[PDB]
Each structure stands twice: as C-alpha cells, then as structure tokens.
C-alpha cells in the first residue's frame, strides 16, 4: 500500500555534563534503518536494517557529515531557545524534530511533514502546503520570521518532493522482501474469571507488521469502546508487534461478545470469540 519515511532528531542539553547529546533515527514505515548518536565512542550514521547496508561509503560518509552538522545546529538552537523563553543556563531542555514524506502505492507524494518541539511541546510546524508555517507561541514566531526571510520552506519543499520521495522509493525497492510484506496477526481469545459472576475476555494479536491494527470488542454487535481496556501496541523485538484488548463480562454472557480485528495483512476483518 502506502509508505512513509520519517527521521526523528532529539537534542538534549545537560549543563555541567558536557555538550548536548544529539540522537537521530530514520524509519521507513515501522522499520528503523539508521541511527546516529553523538555519545557513541565513534559517532557515525550506522545501519539498523539489512537492506540499507548495500549503500556505499559515499552514502555513509555523507550522512555522517550531515548528522554532525545537524548536531552542531541543534546545540546552537538549544542556546537560542534559552534566550527566547528567558530560561537559566542551569536546566536541561530538549528539542525534537520529525520530518519526512508519505507516498501512495504508485510512489507519488501524498504529503510532506516537518515539525519541531521544545520541551515536548509543539514549537513550529511546516503546514501541509509546504510553503507556510504554524508557530506555537511568540518565541516560535521569531523563528518563523527568520525562516521566512531565509526561504527555508522552499528548501524543505524541494527536499520533500524530490530527494525524500526518490530515496524512499529506492529503500522500498531494496527492502521489498520486508518493507513491502505485511504479516497478519495471529489471534486468540483468553478467558479468566475474576469472580463468580464476572470474567475477563482478552483478545490477542501477535506477530503482525506493520504496527497499525484495530482490535475492538462488540457485545450483541455494539462496540464496547468505553468499556474496553486497550494496551498500547508494543514491539516484539523481531520486527513484529503485539496488542491486546480486554473486556469484563458477566459470567454466562461470554458468547454475546465478539472481537473484531482489522489489519493490512488480512484480506478481510476477522471476527473471533472465546472458544471454551
């Protein structure tokens, strides 16, 4: 189907403990493929997926140089932000950035993204038009004026429509065995009494990729959204994900409940029930 490439940068200051740490990671969909960590014994952009390993020395040297340059830029931005928010040099603060492109099945740009935060709050975001900005507060408006004066939006647009999509398409081809394979969930329902008159039914999905999934409980055909406990989708460590949804039901009414599973790997949504 459709695919995304996303990079994530985190810059974290630590006054008294050296210069800020800069970590960058890159993803295609839910597959991490590169990392850079300024705290590594020898910082470089490094592979994290087998299909990226075939890129040559020019690629790795180029990415490493760019990540060092970026780390310098974000260390400076942390100083700047201290001035913009009238903050002391004694605290630790974090800048985060995420950016990338989304393409459809035909490889065409669906949309581009570039968003930044300061201390976990929205700071400034490129709008979907890739030509204007949304600044979250008066500090970010200072940044917005600088970026407008420097035509930063034009440069990002050129990236997001050009190299971003081109490289994503390349990665999708080089990693097609995995990036273009959906693994459907393996599903089952467990039942555990909590008392003489209620039981938990828990609908499990395991071993699926990509992470996006919907698990819902229905009682007599009606969604039990308010009454369902849903855990966050979690990584298994072998590329796949896991998730469960639970509902507490009156004893003797278990058969009135059905779990419904939607996942890209499934030709049609699954309905399952507790099978005693």
């Amino acid at each position: 189907g459709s695919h995304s490439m996303r990079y994530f940068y985190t810059a974290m200051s630590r006054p008294g403990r050296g210069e800020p740490r800069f970590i960058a990671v890159g993803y295609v969909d839910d597959t991490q493929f590169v990392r850079f960590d300024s705290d590594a014994a020898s910082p470089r952009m490094a592979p994290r997926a087998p299909w990226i390993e075939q890129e040559g020395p020019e690629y790795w040297d180029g990415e490493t140089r760019n990540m060092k340059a970026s780390a310098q830029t974000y260390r400076e931005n942390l100083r700047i932000a201290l001035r913009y928010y009238n903050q002391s040099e004694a605290g630790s603060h974090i800048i985060q950035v995420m950016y990338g492109c989304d393409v459809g099945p035909d490889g065409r740009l669906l949309r581009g993204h570039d968003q930044s935060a300061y201390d976990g709050k929205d700071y400034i975001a490129l709008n979907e038009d890739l030509s204007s900005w949304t600044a979250a507060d008066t500090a970010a408006q200072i940044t917005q004026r600088k970026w407008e004066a420097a035509r930063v939006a034009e440069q990002l647009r050129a990236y997001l429509e050009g190299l971003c999509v081109e490289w994503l398409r390349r990665y999708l081809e080089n990693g097609k065995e995995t990036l273009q394979r959906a693994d459907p969930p393996k599903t089952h329902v467990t039942h555990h009494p909590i008392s003489d008159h209620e039981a938990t039914l828990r609908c499990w999905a395991l071993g699926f990729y990509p992470a996006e999934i919907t698990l819902t409980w229905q009682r007599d055909g009606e969604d039990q959204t308010q009454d369902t406990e849903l855990v966050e989708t979690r990584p298994a460590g072998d590329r796949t994900f896991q998730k469960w949804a639970a509902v507490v039901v009156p004893s003797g009414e278990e058969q009135r409940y059905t779990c419904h599973v939607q996942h890209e790997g499934l030709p049609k949504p699954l309905t399952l029930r507790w099978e005693p």
């Binding site: 830029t73 930063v152 990002l156 971003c164």
Partner: peptide
C-alpha cells in the same frame, strides 16, 4: 537520506 538545510532557530 536526510535533509541538508540549515535550520537556525
């Protein structure tokens, strides 16, 4: 491939 654009705040 990462973006190369200067983003001074």
């Amino acid at each position: 491939l990462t973006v190369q654009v200067a983003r001074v705040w």
